[PDB]
Every structure is written in C-alpha cells, then in structure tokens.
Ligand binder design. Structure first.
Ligand SMILES: CN(C)c1ccc(C(=O)O)c(Oc2nc(Oc3cccc(-c4cccc(CN)c4)c3)c(F)c(N3CC[C@@H](N(C)C)C3)c2F)c1
Length: 245
C-alpha cells in the first residue's frame, strides 16, 4: 500500500496473509485474502495461477506483521484451492480474478473467533455503495517504488469508489473494465494498492457492518494519476461463492 498508515490486525481482523512454503522452513509472502467463513478465505486467482498446487501454501489469520509473530495468530494449510475456471488475463486486466481457499489448521480445525480474527460480511447481490463512498484496503504490499523490502507492519488506506462509467472513459481504462470489476482511487492519487496487495480486501462499512465489496486485482502502476486500482466486484460472484462453499 502506497500512502496510508500502519495498522494492526485488531483493526482489520478478517485479513488473511497467504505465503508459499519452501524446503527448509522458509516462506515467501504471496498475497492477501479475507476470511468470509470459519473455513473459507477468499483471494484472487492470479496470485496462484502459476503455482496452483494447494500443498505449497500457508495462510495466517490474526497476523499484524509480515516476518514476525503476533500474539494470537493462527496458521492454516490449504485443503482446497479453488480458482475460477474462467479466469484469464489480457494485456491490462485480470478477468474473473477470484479464488477460494479452504483452510485447515495443523490440528484439523477451521478459524476460531477472537479480537484479532473475525469474518467480514459478504455484500448482497448487485448491491454496492454508490461512487464517492469511502472504503478501506489493507495489505503487506510495497509502500514505495524504490523499496526492495515490503513493510513489516500491516498497512491500510482509504480510497473512494469510482463509477463504472468514469472508469470506462478512454483516459482511464476504457473497455478494459467490465461490470464485474470496480474501480477505486484517492481523489489526489496519493494512496493506492501496490505489488503484493492483490487478493486483499476492499471493505466498505454499510450500516455499521463491514462488507467485502472488492478484491484487489490490478491497475496501472501504483498511485498513478487517472489509473485507479481495479478490484473484483464481489457482489457479482455471490452465486459462485455460495455454490463452491
Ligand atoms: C505470483 N505472485 C506471488 C504474485 C504476488 C502479487 C501479485 C500482485 O498483483 O500484487 C502478483 O500479480 C502480479 N504482480 C505484478 O507486479 C506488480 C507491480 C506493481 C504494482 C502491482 C499492483 C498490484 C495490485 C494492484 C495494483 C494497482 N495499483 C498494482 C503489481 C504485476 F505487474 C502483474 N501484472 C502485470 C501484467 C498484468 N496483466 C496480466 C493483467 C498483471 C501481476 F499479475 C503475483
């Protein structure tokens, strides 16, 4: 995340950190995700498409820091990696960029609630906030283009939803964004998702309840003028989520 502030998992208790395992016990961060039910984390397919083997991945919940431990964190294996069968990418966009990870602890249990681990609510079908609404994104992605290190502490920022008609304008993304995507940006183009933030949640507070509205998918650069972040529009995959869960 570019711009934005350090946060703790307490403030983002549905956030899931997804890593890939390596011989020796070392791991490398992959992508973000969100806990939508005790046994299911939702993320983006493009995070896994090159290495679709569920055995290689681990998921943390209740984790505030990238390479050190947080009190109360829970570690999980992936029982089922479900990628969208119609996922694809052209020269700019990911399509149907949504994935489900069935999680299972070493001891065989799903996630348990706590101050640092909670589910986010799913949206209602075709019901999303109107453009201009503030929503938050969270992730361990890069915060600076010249960095070789990702931030050690979780970050968040606030962006505003952009209408589909604005994002489809030629100096934005044109026909590259479909009704199955949503765009969001800082009005001053100062804060944005970046490398490593994909898979993570775009959350909007609806009537008090925090709702998973988007999943970080793609864009052009990070915090570039007239190039909003593009998210998978979760309210259009509810049937897919419901049936595969
Ligand atoms: C395999 N692993 C572990 C990972 C981990 C993280 C990411 C990620 O997206 O963050 C990832 O996907 C990808 N990672 C990239 O690196 C970067 C570099 C800089 C910014 C971003 C980036 C990521 C999310 C949102 C936004 C919008 N501000 C930007 C991604 C890519 F440029 C692509 N392209 C470039 C080509 C384009 N096209 C196929 C749509 C997609 C990509 F698909 C793979």
């Amino acid at each position: 995340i570019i711009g934005g502030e350090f946060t703790t998992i307490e403030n983002q208790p549905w956030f899931a950190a997804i890593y890939r395992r390596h011989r020796g016990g070392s791991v490398t961060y992959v992508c973000g995700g969100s806990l939508i039910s005790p046994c299911w984390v939702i993320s983006a397919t493009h995070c896994f498409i090159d290495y679709p083997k569920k055995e290689d991945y681990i998921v943390y919940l209740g984790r505030s820091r990238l390479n050190s431990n947080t009190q109360g964190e829970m570690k999980f294996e992936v029982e089922n990696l479900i990628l969208h069968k119609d996922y694809s990418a052209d020269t700019l966009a990911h399509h149907n960029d949504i994935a489900l990870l069935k999680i299972r602890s070493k001891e065989g249990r799903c996630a348990q609630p706590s101050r640092t681990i909670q589910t986010i609510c799913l949206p209602s079908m075709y019901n999303d906030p109107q453009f201009g609404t503030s929503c938050e994104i969270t992730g361990f992605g890069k915060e600076n283009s010249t960095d070789y290190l990702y931030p050690e502490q979780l970050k968040m920022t606030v962006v505003k939803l952009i209408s589909h008609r604005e994002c489809q304008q030629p100096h934005y993304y044109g026909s590259e964004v479909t009704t199955k995507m949503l765009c969001a940006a800082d009005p001053q183009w100062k804060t944005d998702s970046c490398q490593g933030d994909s898979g993570g949640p775009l959350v909007c507070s609806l009537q008090g309840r925090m709702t998973l509205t988007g999943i970080v998918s793609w864009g052009r650069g990070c915090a570039l003028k007239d190039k909003p972040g593009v998210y998978t529009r979760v309210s259009h995959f509810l049937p897919w989520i419901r049936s595969h869960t």
